[PDB]
Design a protein around this ligand. Structure first.
Ligand SMILES: N[C@@H](Cc1ccccc1)C(=O)O
Ligand SMILES: N[C@@H](Cc1ccccc1)C(=O)O
Lengths: 278, 278
């Protein structure tokens, strides 16, 4: 399969990401995206893992943890809103821009300055595009992806509509752990400074984490991420997410990992992977 | 009784959180929320900081660091969705459910198992209970808090509509830096197991975090949160959120923090605070 499962519809930032890997299969949900891989509808999938403005997506992490799945690449999507109209395109004739409530909030400047234009709640940003194109009504605007504009044949009225640059979504392209297949991806991950992601669980002892970092830091190994959150039905544990620069088969790495399993209640390696660029 | 600025409208979870602290003052932006304290329109604010399902809210940590403000308390709000309807309304009779797209998608099974009832996007959850009451048709329902339904005289048709039983948002009650008055909260925070929140930035050398954690760990100090993200501002660095148990001016803690301040690029204590139980 060259299908890349994702959550959303065409023009969604999630699709943008699956495009960097292959042919997008859209899915109703996260839970659904992981299942397209499990039951072999799709070989791959791209899941949003963190966003610079929000957090880590702990839902997608519980799924990475539970699904017999493996990360094969990471990618980074710059969420840049476009204000988007029908051909014959004007801001001073419009009565509304539709979009996802969070896009609407993020474009709160545009709205306080443009009160002839009222924020309208839409299910998502891509469908907002979609509505404009079908409503055959040059009055209604959408706030969405350039790709949505592309696609629904709309014009960009306005780029960087929120006064946030650095709204970035990082996604992980994933496959079933019983075939980390790199060869069928659209573009092969840049492996020059390859990353490993793991989850581990510590019994919540004063010191535990210092102790688990020691494992990497006294081994010369650089981290790029670390996060705790509590474990809910294991009594007195936290879960930790940690990424670091290194390949899981590297002996130093392997030594770190074994070192951790000495006192970690569990370790999982979600994968060693490179990066795909726009 | 005293003014707790929060983002949203009556009904909202953020309002439930406001109310554990005083009289809620609803605001359109978090910017408005902080600027409300930072210029004495209100004495406190209730800020969402993380959710067990998404993660940390980076954008809020962002403003907590840039604002002359201090954590006075934390509480934890269980985000519990209800199907709300007018007196007489029915799940077998309903045609629409209105809510925030995220609450829609978090009750995805409900919608799958009830195809008669179409999911319909709205600006937020509480405004959805409002729309239901104002439109007066018994065929249109909302997904919103139990509070939003009471306010609006809507019946609760189903308790616990979401896919995931464990949805919890952690809020900070905040105040102005040099108006850090606990007396005029509505109940004093439980301060037995007092927590301190800090943020800091390190030059990104391998072992940095280990060396920083060494600071608390070799000192008997127990962490309850650790998370990294990359310095939006300095070229080569990371920010870390740390929470731990103790007070700023414990001998221990102070030592730890001073040692930290030795090599951290920056340290700000966001505050030392206990916990408001509903
Ligand atoms: N890479 C540095 C700093 C860092 C730690 C953890 C997460 C992100 C960055 C270290 O290895 O200690
Ligand atoms: N409380 C333990 C484990 C822990 C670390 C960091 C965050 C949460 C828990 C410690 O101080 O190391």
């Amino acid at each position: 399969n060259w299908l890349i499962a994702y959550q959303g519809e065409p023009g969604a930032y999630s699709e943008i990401a699956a495009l960097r890997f292959g042919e997008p299969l859209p899915c109703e949900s996260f839970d659904d995206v992981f299942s397209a891989v499990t039951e072999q509808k799709a070989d791959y999938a791209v899941i949003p893992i963190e966003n610079s403005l929000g957090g880590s997506i702990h839902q997608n992490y519980d799924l990475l943890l539970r699904r017999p799945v493996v990360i094969l690449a990471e990618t980074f999507v710059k969420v840049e809103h476009c204000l988007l109209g029908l051909p014959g395109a004007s801001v001073e004739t419009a009565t509304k821009a539709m979009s996802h409530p969070q896009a609407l909030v993020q474009c709160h400047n545009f709205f306080a300055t443009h009160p002839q234009i009222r924020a309208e709640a839409a299910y998502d940003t891509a469908g907002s595009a979609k509505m404009v194109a079908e409503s055959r009504d040059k009055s209604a605007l959408a706030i969405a992806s350039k790709r949505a504009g592309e696609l629904y044949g709309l014009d960009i009225l306005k780029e960087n509509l929120a006064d946030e640059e650095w709204n970035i979504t990082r996604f992980f392209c994933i496959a079933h752990e019983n075939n980390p297949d790199i060869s069928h991806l659209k573009v092969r991950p840049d492996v020059a400074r390859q990353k490993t992601s793991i989850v581990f669980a510590l019994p919540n002892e004063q010191g535990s984490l210092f102790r688990a970092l020691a494992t990497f830091a006294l081994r010369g190994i650089d981290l790029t991420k670390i996060e705790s959150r509590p474990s809910r039905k294991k009594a007195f544990e936290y879960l930790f997410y940690a990424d670091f620069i290194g390949h899981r088969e590297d002996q130093n790495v392997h030594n770190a990992l074994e070192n951790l399993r000495e006192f970690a209640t569990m370790v999982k390696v979600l994968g060693s992977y490179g990066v795909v660029n726009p």
